[PDB]
From a paper:
One example is the sperm-specific SLC9C1 that belongs to the SLC9 superfamily of cation/proton antiporters, known as Na+/H+ exchangers (NHEs), which are essential for the regulation of intracellular pH, sodium homeostasis and cell volume. The transport domain (TD) is accompanied by a voltage-sensing domain (VSD) and a cyclic-nucleotide binding domain (CNBD), which are regulatory units usually found in voltage-gated cyclic-nucleotide-modulated ion channels, also referred to as CNBD ion channels. In a recent patch-clamp fluorimetry study, the functional integrity of the domains was confirmed for SLC9C1 from the sea urchin [name], termed [name], identifying it as a Na+/H+ exchanger that is activated strictly by hyperpolarization and modulated by cyclic nucleotides (cNMPs). Specifically, [name] adapted to mediate cellular alkalization in sperm only in response to chemoattractant-induced hyperpolarization.
To investigate the impact of ligand binding on the conformation of [name], we solved the structures of the protein in the presence of cGMP and [name]. In all cases, we could identify prominent densities within the CNBD corresponding to bound nucleotides, which were not present in the apo cryo-EM maps. Overall, the best-resolved cGMP- and [name]-bound dimer structures, at 3.2 Å and 3.3 Å, respectively, share a similar conformation to the apo structure. However, we could identify key differences. Although image processing of the cGMP dataset revealed only one dominant conformation, the [name]-bound dataset displayed a high degree of conformational heterogeneity throughout data analysis, and, in particular, the CTD was generally less resolved and mobile. In most of the three-dimensional (3D) classes and as observed in the 3D variability analysis, the dimer interaction between the β-CTDs is disrupted in the presence of [name], which causes the CTD to swing away from the symmetry axis. The observed flexibility in the CTD is also accompanied by a higher mobility of the VSDs, although at no point does the VSD approach the transport domain. Further, the extracellular tip of TM1 rotates around P75 towards the symmetry axis, pushing the TD protomers apart. Minor conformational differences between the three structures are β4 and β5 of the β-CNBD positioning closer to the bound nucleotides and a slight movement of helix C towards the β-CNBD in the [name]-bound structure. Here, binding of [name] causes the disruption of the dimer interface in the CTD, conferring it a higher mobility (state 4).
Author numbering:
A (entry chain A), B (entry chain B): 72 to 537, 571 to 653, 676 to 705, 725 to 783, 794 to 1012, 1031 to 1191
């Protein structure tokens, strides 16, 4: 059979690709040129040696179908799949203008040249096929350099996206003109041509979109089956192309492009193992396709093409190379007035790279082989193949090698001083670690006599990269140094999962954009562009909710019944539109019986709802459709004008009333869009707030100048406050979406720490490897089920807020008491709930709204639902520390200090209510104190809070003296009250970090300021 | 074209497999039965609806070639690839006996039944095809249960290996009898039949072995190219099959089996990413093959088979099911007298599982489809397909579901108390961690109002599994508790890379075997089976080294010349054996010119070496071959008997002398085999020593009974000492191999810690993600280059040992001094180098041999090259602490205390020589002290040593008082000398762990016992 033999030839191609790719890794020329050389050699061998000709001929040629329907889909999908979708969408308008118009203009100009330069006397359709071939690109070799050098990352994204769209549209143009040349048909009317344009250009992406959304839907519902996900992705990728191109005659390649982009975007719905597998799998297929195409080009160019090449063809080829380079540069320059004003903009030297980086590749060669096959004996196939191969070789030899020197000359290969210094520091760190390990290993019993001259050489890692004027100098130093601290903070937040990858990239992009620009800091108005939702979706949401504003089984039954009955309707009316004696009778009978049994909705609803049945708007349509069907059924017991109008009405009216059930789902879709935008804005805002709170502890130990310190601290806080206000406003604008976004991240954090506990048990050897996977898989299934959480969650009632406060969360009997003794208060904008210095009246738990707080230790921040205000008012029993003002309509539970005192004095079990309240206060006191001692040591706020979570209040009043052992402790904070050192007799009367040299403490009955102390176990 | 359509059908199969696999996950029946049902439905549809018949018929049938040459290789290779090779090799004799003989006996018995039960009147060849089909297996559904239950892991390995070999040999038997039935040929002679048997049974595995070794060779030389590795593996896998089955007519399937097993074994030569990709890729292909085969079976069984099935065929099918189950059980029982005495043995209930677990699968169905296609219109194809499908369905419905209940009834589904308790503890740990994180999250500003009723329910992980008599009870408790501590230690050593995976599995197997057996502890003689090298390779090594015992370019030129000239020789003599006028003349001329130019070896060597040229043995053959060629060339200037003998001699003599160059490489091969065995033994011994040294610190805090304590401590040390002796002996037996094995692990440890430093910088955000990958890739390329390190490394000279001692390793001027003042001593067995209580004479650095040490703090251990003996003899200047005796011929550098005192008093820079010596002493003192405080806390010895590596000696004598701050320190050990507490005035005169409550220390001029103190920075 032929299939084993083609697999054999594919494996031969595999090994030749391996050889070429391995040996010429040193040399600058890419391996594809070596594959062309090998193809040429194999061609001459198979020509002069018939013993191998008769074997190889059977596989040496490829039908147009295998090219256009296997190779091109693979290449185009792999290109669409490896792309970073988000930056592409960020630059879509620029990349799409450049691709879709530059392709047309470049192909037209190339076709004009091919008619006027070459003596081949081609007509315009042939020249346009030629231009479409010569306009394809393959910059995989250049985007790699732009990624490695790191400079102008947006340029790499733009070039790659342009290549993707350019290749897709080039294939479409080729498919048109190939038909006009090799499969001519009679002149179609303008209307049919317009429909054909819409079929290829508009139906394609829409078909891809539909299949992509269906595929991601199903992928979101598969668990513990990597094979099913992989298989579904592959089957969808091929069926999209085949059904599009063959059955629908819709542009398959564009649908495949859209499918790749969408599936890449929705990567969160795919388990990570399947993600990495799919990336490597499509890379492998693209590699095989490239090797096969290049070797086939060499073989057939020696066998069939070069036998008909004249001395003038080489001159034409050189002129063509110059012409296409000039055309591409001219196109880019001509659109520069537009591209400069959209997306990323376009620097001159970026335009130079984009011109020079236009490598041609496998797509053009595959199209040239299609032409060569279809042309048969005509010279046009040989001319096409020769010129395409010549251009490919010239670009891969000249451009693909000189691109590096061009990057150097234009001044872009220079790696920035920041990154160079970071690399040098990291290398020295690694080197010191190696030195330590070398010493230990030398000081060991078993490996004492290893040849260290070999080992030390073997491990050596080496560097890969090798007064007011003074006040402005120091200011620019501090500016860049602070932005570096912000970058570090954003990465640290990412690694623990406080940040989504997209939020991280947004923040890092804003930080590097702020670094290169003069006198700049991260602009809060550039962050606001995230959570400021575009009004389209809110508009739609309120509209649909307005539009949607008797047992449960009835509507389920009727909604099923519509789907059931539409099949008879369409079956009959399509037949009547197209044009068994029992079948038409059976269809009419089915219509009549359906109309009869529709009493179970019509009259049942009329009687159940009573006279007011018609008040509900949709029941009016329910009556109307029955009225129409009654007449058009009664007619049967009594012409063209009857039937051709009934076939309109009895279809149209029956499908319409399904929208009543459809709207609730579109509401969910709008909610999902709003949820995604709100979640991204929330993540970036929270990340920025935390980054400012962390960098605002580092700067006090990192700039000396006590004027630059104040200016940077002011810029930091004036940025922070706007965000903390706006995030509070977002909740009020869209409550339930925010509630869902909060619950989701809560679960995510819990699951991450559960995985870390599992890995700790695994590394400690307390849990088997096979048991570790079994637990981890449940962790992952829960994590994936997070993606299917409702996009909106109903906000909890206030009693559920009381039920969940950290200190209330315990005894049901205490919760019942607090229900029995509480009051609910409501306040308007600008009402001030708390003043400084007033005596304690009770505790406030805010259940709605946003409040601003102010007071000297200043403290200008805000609080929101679930926060408790006046925490120690009944513990310390002293004048208020701060003022609280309503920034919004605010609702709180107020429980009087008289109400507290009873429970305070009565709930005295070992998990004491006073103990719980003081611990809630102590964590808040302790966190800044721990940070001020460790922010430069590298911990984040959340690890600080988890570290303090293990701690407990010191059980004083057993006796008023204590000293501790570090074998049972690791940190101490004095929260409140008066204490004094047992050795030095120095008093401590402040919230203080108890330094680790403080040996022994003693206390006394300063009854107004009684002590509390907090300690952490190892 | 046909290829796009077959891809479409494959994608349809993909989606049906996805549906069946997803929906029936709850139900017990496997999805393949659902695929058969779907195939049946599709068959009846395509039968009664010609509109889809005309479309589907083109793909519905499959040629025998696509089955036998695509599907079967894929299935067999995937089976061979997923297998754990090492346990399979450990049980190979048992599994191979059972597979290769049970297959023959079962197929013969089934064929006899098929002749005698069925009225089909088959001949013996047809019945043997039938038996070969019915003897195939597919236990993938049962080995999964045996892996999940964890009981009888060896049984899972045995069943899986039996299936692999059984399927391979069944395909071979089928290929024989299919030829005899459907492609008959004339009766061959017995000799040709014997050659055919050798061609199928012996040449197959050898061809697979050759391709496997070549493939792993090339894979060992590829770096930073995952695609090349993947591509080469796939190309090799298919070319092995194709070249074997088609060009060589050698059994392809067996070669594929051997290739899969070998490539799986050599996984260390493949980058891990390529490993996981290949596993998932072959799983995917096997899944596709299974789905396609089952659906095709359903389609064709409805279209062609069931139309010719009678009421008696069902009775035959049921009788056949019973018969094959009985036959398999009988075979297993009959071989039980043999299988019980080899490999794993065979428990009765294991035999019951193996009988009931014999699921049939895709291989039998594919062979049945081959028969059905070849039979054409004959009833035999329908009978074969019907019976095969019936057996498959019966086994998948009955056996595949009842296997779980059988495992329960026989008493194997019960999970052991140890694992249940471990799971309960791990679950409670995870639950407590979730509780902590829940509390913190509640005590947070941003997520305060998340619906915790949703979150807490969402994250909940749940348990998956739900007096002398008293002295013996306590003894069995301590025995099992110690073995559990050993298991933990072996896992902890693995996670940091002190152990190879195989060494870990050896130790864990020995630990669990020792746990289930009564009154048992890990037997040192079971560890010895690792490093006790079988004598074959040492024998070969010495033999080849004996056999192998004038400018450099000459031999390179001649070794190339032999390879060059053999091509003319073979080209001429094959032609003369087979039977251009210029070509034969040119060949003779080439022979004569080669003989003439061979003067450049013959006479050049004779003159260069002189008269004694003939003394070297190989020069005698060099002269002999020239003598023979001279006569047979001179003949041309003067018949059959001439030519047919010259064609023997002038070939044979020319190839022989290449063995002189070949032997040096075979020496390397033998060295590699010895290296692998020695390395595995070394790893297991070192792991056992460290495990005993760690568990020997835990037991003092883990058993109360001070008699069971002594007995277990004695069993531990008496095991340890034998290993520490034998590992010392191994070095002397095979020096350079041991040196290479030491250097390799040194580099491995350094690279692991370098990777950890990189990940630390990455997590701290100090290094970019893209920079982190760039460094990590260099780390990985170095790690992979470790695999190509020489298998033997020449032992360093003594001056290189002096050059590398931890304290000598510094100033070149000090090294020069030590060269200037040193002495080298040699000692025999039983000479005692050091006695207790003698005055200091100097320091010993051992450069060769093994010495035993003894002394009260007892200390009964050994030391080896690179160890220094008498470390503080010139520091403390007091009577010796211990006795040292030569266990072997021993050589040491002895440098007199008089020689020390000068350098001690002169090398006083900041990196003081005395400082370095005291630090070398201090680490040795400090390590046990840190372990005794932390062994139960979970640290290993190596993390202890790395922790101490950061520490330094306290710079006393600035003033004799000090106190420290934990913000600059983390641990303290007092090494030697006299100190006293500043507050309590208590003296300290012992090597002591300075507990963290010790605030302040003071010292004094007790000149005989001056103090040294060691502290660790954070």
């Amino acid at each position: 059979a032929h299939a084993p033999k083609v697999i054999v030839f594919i494996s031969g191609s595999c090994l030749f690709g391996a050889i070429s790719r391995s040996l010429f890794k040193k040399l600058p020329i890419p391996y594809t040129v070596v594959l062309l050389i090998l193809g040429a050699i194999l061609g001459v061998v198979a020509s002069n040696v018939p013993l191998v000709e008769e074997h190889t001929r059977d596989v040496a040629h490829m039908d147009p179908h295998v090219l256009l329907q296997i190779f091109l889909p693979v290449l185009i999908f792999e290109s669409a799949f490896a792309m970073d979708v988000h930056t592409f969408m960020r630059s879509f308008s620029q990349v799409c203008i450049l691709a879709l118009f530059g392709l047309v203009v470049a192909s037209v100009l190339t076709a004009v040249l091919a008619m006027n330069l070459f003596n081949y006397n081609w007509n315009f359709s042939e020249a346009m096929m030629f231009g479409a071939i010569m306009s394809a690109t393959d910059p995989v070799a250049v985007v790699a350099l732009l990624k490695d050098l790191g400079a102008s990352k947006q340029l790499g994204t733009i070039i790659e996206g342009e290549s993707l769209l350019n290749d897709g549209c080039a294939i479409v143009i080729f498919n048109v003109f190939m038909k006009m040349v090799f499969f001519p048909q009679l002149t179609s009317t303008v209307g049919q041509n317009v429909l054909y344009f819409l079929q290829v250009a508009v139906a394609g992406p829409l078909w891809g979109y539909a299949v992509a959304k269906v595929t991601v839907f199903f992928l979101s519902h598969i668990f513990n089956d990597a094979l099913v996900e992989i298989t579904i992705t592959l089957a969808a990728t091929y069926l999209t192309y085949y059904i599009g191109d063959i059955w629908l005659e819709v542009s398959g390649v564009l649908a495949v492009v859209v499918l790749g982009l969408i599936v890449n975007a929705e990567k969160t719905s795919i388990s990570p193992e399947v993600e990495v597998f799919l990336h490597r799998f499509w890379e492998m297929l693209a590699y095989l396709a490239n090797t096969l195409i290049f070797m086939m080009v060499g073989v057939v160019v020696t066998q069939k093409a070069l036998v008909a090449v004249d001395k003038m063809d080489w001159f034409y080829l050189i002129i063509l190379y110059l012409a296409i380079t000039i055309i591409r540069g001219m196109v880019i320059s001509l659109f520069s007035p537009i591209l400069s004003r959209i997306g990323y903009g376009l620097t001159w030297r970026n335009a130079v790279i984009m011109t020079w980086g236009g490598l041609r590749g496998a797509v053009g060669l595959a199209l040239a082989l299609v032409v060569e096959n279809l042309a048969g004996n005509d010279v046009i196939g040989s001319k096409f193949l020769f010129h395409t191969a010549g251009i490919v070789v010239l670009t891969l030899v000249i451009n693909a090698t000189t691109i590096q020197t061009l990057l150097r000359i234009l001044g872009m290969s220079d790696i920035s001083i920041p990154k160079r210094l970071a690399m040098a520091g990291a290398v020295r760190r690694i080197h010191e670690g190696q030195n330590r390990t070398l010493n230990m290993l030398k000081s060991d019993r078993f490996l004492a006599d290893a040849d260290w001259d070999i080992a030390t050489a073997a491990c050596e890692i080496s560097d890969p990269y090798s007064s007011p004027r003074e006040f402005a100098d120091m200011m620019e130093e501090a500016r860049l140094r602070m932005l570096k601290a912000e970058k570090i903070s954003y990465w640290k937040q990412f690694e623990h999962g406080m940040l989504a990858r997209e939020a991280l990239r947004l923040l890092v992009q804003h930080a590097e954009v702020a670094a290169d620009e003069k006198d700049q800091f991260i602009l809060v108005d550039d962050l606001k562009k995230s959570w400021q939702i575009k009004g389209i979706y809110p508009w739609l949401k309120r509209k649909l909710e307005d539009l949607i504003s008797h047992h449960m089984a009835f509507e389920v039954t009727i909604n099923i019944a519509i789907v059931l009955n539409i099949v008879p309707i369409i079956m009959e009316f399509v037949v009547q539109d197209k044009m068994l004696q029992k079948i038409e009778d059976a269809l009419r009978i089915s219509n009549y019986v359906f109309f009869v049994i529709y009493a179970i909705e019509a009259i049942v609803k009329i009687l159940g709802l009573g006279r007011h049945y018609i008040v509900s708007h949709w029941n009016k349509f329910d009556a109307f459709i029955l009225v129409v069907a009654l007449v058009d059924i009664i007619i049967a017991e009594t012409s063209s004008i009857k039937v051709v109008k009934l076939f309109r009405l009895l279809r149209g009216l029956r499908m319409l009333r399904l929208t009543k059930a459809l709207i609730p789902k579109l509401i969910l879709v709008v909610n999902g869009k709003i949820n995604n935008q709100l979640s991204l804005g929330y993540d970036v805002g929270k990340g920025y707030i935390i980054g400012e709170e962390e960098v605002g502890k580092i700067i006090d130990r990192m700039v000396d100048n006590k004027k630059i310190l104040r200016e940077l601290k002011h810029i930091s806080e004036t940025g922070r406050l706007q965000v903390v206000k706006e995030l509070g406003l977002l909740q009020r604008e869209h409550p339930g979406i925010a509630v869902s976004v909060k619950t989701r991240q809560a679960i995510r954090t819990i699951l991450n720490h559960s995985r870390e506990t599992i890995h700790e048990l695994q590394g400690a050897g307390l849990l088997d490897e096979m048991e570790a996977h079994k637990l981890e898989l449940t962790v992952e299934i829960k994590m994936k089920r997070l993606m299917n959480a409702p996009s909106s969650i109903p906000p909890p009632p206030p009693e559920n807020l009381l039920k969940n406060v950290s200190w209330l969360a315990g005894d049901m009997k205490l919760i019942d008491f607090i229900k029995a003794r509480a009051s609910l208060l409501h306040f308007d904008y600008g009402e001030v709930i708390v003043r400084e210095g007033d005596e304690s009246d009770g505790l406030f738990l805010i259940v709605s709204g946003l409040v601003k707080l102010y007071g000297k230790s200043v403290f200008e921040d805000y609080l929101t639902v679930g926060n408790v205000i006046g925490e120690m008012g009944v513990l310390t029993k002293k004048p208020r520390n701060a003022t609280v003002t309503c920034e919004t309509t605010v609702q709180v539970y107020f429980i009087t200090a008289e109400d507290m005192n009873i429970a305070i004095d009565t709930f005295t079990l070992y998990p004491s209510l006073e103990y719980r309240l003081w611990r809630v206060v102590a964590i808040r006191i302790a966190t800044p104190l721990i940070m001020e001692q460790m922010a430069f040591q590298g911990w984040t706020q959340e690890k600080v809070k988890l570290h303090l979570e293990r701690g407990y209040l010191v059980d004083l009043a057993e006796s008023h003296f204590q000293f501790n052992i570090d074998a049972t402790l690791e940190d101490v904070i004095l929260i409140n009250g008066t204490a004094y050192n047992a050795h030095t007799r120095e008093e401590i009367r402040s919230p203080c970090l108890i330094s680790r040299t403080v040996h022994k403490l003693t206390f006394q009955y300063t009854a107004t300021e009684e002590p509390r102390l907090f300690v952490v176990r190892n």
